[PDB]
Amino acid sequence: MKLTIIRLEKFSDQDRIDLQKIWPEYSPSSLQVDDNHRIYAARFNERLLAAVRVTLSGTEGALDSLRVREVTRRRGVGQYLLEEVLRNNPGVSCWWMADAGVEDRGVMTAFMQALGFTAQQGGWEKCS
Amino acid sequence: XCAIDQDFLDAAGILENEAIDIWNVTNGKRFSTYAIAAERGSRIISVNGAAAHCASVGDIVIIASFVTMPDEEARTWRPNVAYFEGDNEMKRTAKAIPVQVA
Amino acid sequence: XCAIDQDFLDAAGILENEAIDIWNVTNGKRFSTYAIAAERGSRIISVNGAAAHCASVGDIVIIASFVTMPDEEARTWRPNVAYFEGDNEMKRTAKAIPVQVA
Amino acid sequence: XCAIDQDFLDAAGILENEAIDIWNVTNGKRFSTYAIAAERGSRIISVNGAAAHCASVGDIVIIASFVTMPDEEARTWRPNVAYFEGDNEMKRTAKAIPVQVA
């Protein structure tokens, strides 16, 4: 099906395959989720193309481990993923993402600014 | 729709989002759609959406694109032809089709 | 796809590798492909690959090509028409189709 | 044909009187016509005249238009894609189709 953002609470075999491509650093084994520690992913034609981890603390939220697979970049996947995480967590008024682990801060900062975030010391912030 | 390994697009000179014609040797159906990219190296030929009424897995197809140009350039144009066998293993690329002889 | 005697291509102004439409008087099928050259003088009209689902040996067809041009030139354009009988014996060439009268 | 809510025309970049292709996911039919405008906000997709032989109420379709441009601009072209669910509720607009991965 068309590009769709999903909250993953249970992982299929294929989700595990795909998450290992998105995040080779992580064992899908230790991707534990609960109500305040979430995984959102972008699905297209039965495969995950991107994912991000979300930590909720009421009005404050944090993003980590955002990654779109290399092969499908610059086609709006990351933008849609983050738009839907924000839209689906309307109680969060201030979002933060650290700059830890990013492949290229120049690329990441252009993407985060296009998504309405402001570059700050150590990362990017979006408050309403 | 049809998602196609990027390497195959490159070999035939076909662009992502370009109009393509698909001619099915297995069942005779002929249809027109546009090219979606598939991951380089995947060997994928994926007939998607309404187009899936026109093909089955394993069917053998020819995928073509067409361009326009003035008459003078058309007389010396060379098409980008790529030939496949087995499980989408590319055998040869060329720039002409031979003449069929008696 | 369709391989065509080069002399017939020349008479209709059709190029090797040009898009062509094929309209089958015998069975009513209509399809689009491109022109492959066949040896000059062979009289060949060979419907090849997936297109062979659309015709049989002995079928009678019309093979056409289309070009684009500005409106002003279109009003005085003359098509290259070639007429065949029997075993692909060319009877006449012309530059116009008559008016059908009551 | 096909009369289409003006808002949907705008979202896909399709013009009134433009040629369109319609690909029917429900029944597999593929046909070409032109766009008629329907009242903004009506959500109408009305398959009219001879085209009504090709679709029924409730059928799910893809409606596409195609444009021509030089090779260099085609390599960086971004199509106007609009996605619908339910009773023609527009879910998303975008400017690219993702890559299908293995």
């Binding site: - | 195959f8 994928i44 197809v61 073509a64 989408n88 | 070009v67 041009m69 | -």
Partner: peptide, 24 residues
């Protein structure tokens, strides 16, 4: 006078997937 010419082709590729629910 503008002609329509074969730009290129993939000859005898094999369909790997056929799915009505895929985009499309």
């Amino acid at each position: 006078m503008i002609r329509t010419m074969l730009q290129g082709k993939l000859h005898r590729v094999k369909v790997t997937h056929a799915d009505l629910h895929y985009e499309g």
